[PDB]
Design a protein around this ligand. Structure first.
Ligand SMILES: *[C@](O)(C(=O)NC)[C@H](CCC(C)(F)F)NC(=O)[C@@H]1[C@H]2CCC[C@H]2CN1C(=O)[C@@H](NC(=O)OC)C(C)(C)C
Ligand SMILES: *[C@](O)(C(=O)NC)[C@H](CCC(C)(F)F)NC(=O)[C@@H]1[C@H]2CCC[C@H]2CN1C(=O)[C@@H](NC(=O)OC)C(C)(C)C
Lengths: 302, 302
């Protein structure tokens, strides 16, 4: 029993973190096979950041302008190219610690683990979700650019996020491992703000199932609701629409607990309208939305 | 910016996890140098668990009764001994992935990362605290025994917890890596209950400093309090006493934010008496107590 915000073991990713320096900018890179992936803004100076033309800035660089360090050893850069907002540095050595990996671009609502790094050294691991407004609520300081987010599927590391920036509200923006930003953000130091965020409804329902699996049932009720009437209440509280596909994905949890999805929706509706009345669910006084249905099944079934 | 429940990168510990089987009981072991450490209850049967005499049960075992598997390879057991509630199995191979390590017995209020494992395979990592009642609020299923808790200090892994059991309230009990239980618990399937828990006051204050460092200041006030008057209010809310040593440990955070410890105590007193009035601190509607002052400095300073 128990339910924690649980990250994937980070070992397979720790064995891929390197330091990348270009001029006075040092950040992290991801070394897989003979390629090091990092944010392309590693080529910028403070003046360039305001409005950079990355194609020009990269044309002015050579392989020797990039210093890649894997622990105590230097990896010679033998080639370079830009793919969207990432820079790919071909190196002379294939990483012997390269795990089985994939690059995936996730959807909002999906969770992942972040391995926060500084100077190519892993510092900590935590669990995030891609918010509906395409930001992540991470914990990143200057030097963390190039830190990655990932999921582990059996023995395959699926990389889904690379860190690039912090928005004025303290939330974070970045790209997939092919350098495409999540959301409308751009890698330039200019006025950008996250849109209004919403609650990931399917994940709140998944976490209410986790609470039931763990013996927290106080919020359950005899009522059911229709998907339409639930969505009418959900919109009012800035919750994402619950779809029939979401109801289907919650099927296994619904069957394991004997509580139909629309029955759980009536509990969520009652919680949204009345609050918790001084009570907690899984040690939280707020409705948690950063566990997917898969995270709940994984953690509760091992 | 940002503040998350952050675990240490688990790689160094993942490289030490093995599976240990004795009869039909399979659990996890920790392989460091040529020794595998695991819960001694691996030698018990369901009938033995009610009231075992471990000295007898171990005398009846031989090295060949223990099956140690490190991934796909079998590690031959060449010796065995019991130290408190842990079993130490000497094996024919020294772990080539043995990090720089120490075994430490932590105090209540200290935090650590748990690498949850099943059949010698790491499943997830999360952050815990040793509660004042000597339990941990973990997330563990059957098969997780032998999973360890640790801190990483520079390049040294300090192991502090090995998982053994779950109490009726859903919280967890275990030992240090030398097999001494935290708290009054014993490794036998009999009536045991955790005592009433309290809030780790020094950690709540550390997290209020983390909130200020991250721009959350709504709870601050112009008042100060005395250590005695704060402790009089703290006892009323089941909070641990705040000591002068705690006030000293919070010194660096107090100096970085310009808010004296007793000034922050007046904020905590006001929060305990009035509540949050619909507001949150670092995304929480409860006062968090599972970040130590060191965790805050580490995460906020990188
Ligand atoms: C990152 O480049 C790094 O770690 N380099 C050593 C750095 C990470 C900062 C933080 C707080 F998120 F960890 N990112 C930046 O400084 C980025 C940089 C690349 C893309 C634009 C350029 C500015 N920038 C920012 O994060 C700025 N934010 C915005 O411009 O938001 C619209 C600030 C420096 C935070 C104002
Ligand atoms: C652990 O032995 C294991 O993973 N083995 C394969 C197991 C872990 C259970 C859990 C839920 F915490 F992950 N631990 C036990 O089953 C222990 C076992 C060793 C010490 C006593 C004996 C019973 N036990 C318990 O956890 C029981 N709890 C108590 O007896 O609490 C007083 C239950 C089986 C949970 C009732």
């Amino acid at each position: 029993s128990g339910f924690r915000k649980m990250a994937f073991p980070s070992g397979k990713v720790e064995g891929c973190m390197v330091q990348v320096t270009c001029g006075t900018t040092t950040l992290n890179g991801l070394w897989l096979d003979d390629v090091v992936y990092c944010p392309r803004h590693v080529i910028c100076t403070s003046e360039d950041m305001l409005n950079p033309n990355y194609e020009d800035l990269l044309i002015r660089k050579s392989n020797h302008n990039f210093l890649v360090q894997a622990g105590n050893v230097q990896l010679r850069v033998i080639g370079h190219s830009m793919q969207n907002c990432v820079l790919k540095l071909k190196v002379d050595t294939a990483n012997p610690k390269t795990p089985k990996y994939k690059f995936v671009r996730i959807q909002p609502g999906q969770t992942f683990s972040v391995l926060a790094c500084y100077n190519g050294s892993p510092s900590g691991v935590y669990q995030c979700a891609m918010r509906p407004n395409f930001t992540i609520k991470g914990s990143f300081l200057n030097g963390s650019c190039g830190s990655v987010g990932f999921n582990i599927d059996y023995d395959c590391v699926s990389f889904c996020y690379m860190h690039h920036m912090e928005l004025p509200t303290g939330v974070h923006a970045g790209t997939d491992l092919e350098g495409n930003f999540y959301g409308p953000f751009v890698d330039r130091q200019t006025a950008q703000a996250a849109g209004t965020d919403t609650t990931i409804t399917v994940n709140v329902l998944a976490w209410l199932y986790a609470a039931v699996i763990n013996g927290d049932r106080w919020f359950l009720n005899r009522f059911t609701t229709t998907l339409n009437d639930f969505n009418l209440v959900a919109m009012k509280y800035n919750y994402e629409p619950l779809t029939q596909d979401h109801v289907d994905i919650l099927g296994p949890l619904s069957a394991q607990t004997g509580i139909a999805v629309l029955d759980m929706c009536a509990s969520l509706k009652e919680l949204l309208q009345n609050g918790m009345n001084g009570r907690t669910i899984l040690g939280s006084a707020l409705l948690e939305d950063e566990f997917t249905p898969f995270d709940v099944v994984r953690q509760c079934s091992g």
